[PDB]
Amino acid sequence: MGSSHHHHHHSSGLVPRGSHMASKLKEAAEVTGSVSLEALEEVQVGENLEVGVGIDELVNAEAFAYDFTLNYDENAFEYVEAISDDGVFVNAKKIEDGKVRVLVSSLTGEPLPAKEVLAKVVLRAEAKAEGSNLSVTNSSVGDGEGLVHEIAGTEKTVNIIEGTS
DSSP states (O other), rough: OOOOOSSSSSOOOOOOOOOOOOOOOOOOOOOOOOOEOOOOOOEEESSSOOEEEEEEEESSOOSOOOEEEEEETTTTOOOOEEEOOEEEEEEEEEEEEEEEEEEEETSSSSSSSSOOOOOOEEEBBSSSOOOOOEEEOOOBBOOOSSSOOOOOEEEEEEEEEEEEO
8 A cells, every 4th residue: 555654765955045943853963063174284396285184073973984075276286196094094086176075984993083184185286376275165974874964164275385496
């Protein structure tokens, strides 16, 4: 007839903004979600930088895979390859100029340690760009259950210093 209760796969868009005041999900388990920006913030043309954007705060979610998307400048900088620590695995994939995706995952056995280097994206300084403001938004996290708690974000900048003269 039509015996159901669970939901296999039923996702929708609903882009349009505008919402009312109504609570459907009892209780509250929303995470703060925050990115950890740690780097020297200074490179020199012909060199590479390593800005490990990890977690600054994540309460109410078990981030197993944190894939972020940094936004740099192709005219000045040049994406190369993402890195990780001596336990977590990282892999970036150039999707656009001055902007590429990164795939992070803890291949250590334990959840994301957070508050440390979760993933660093190296942008080849093949051309100076003093003050080339960069940022990592849409930073998501793979909870232990399966849902992804879109975490906050943070901005950064790096000064490319000319080599010779």
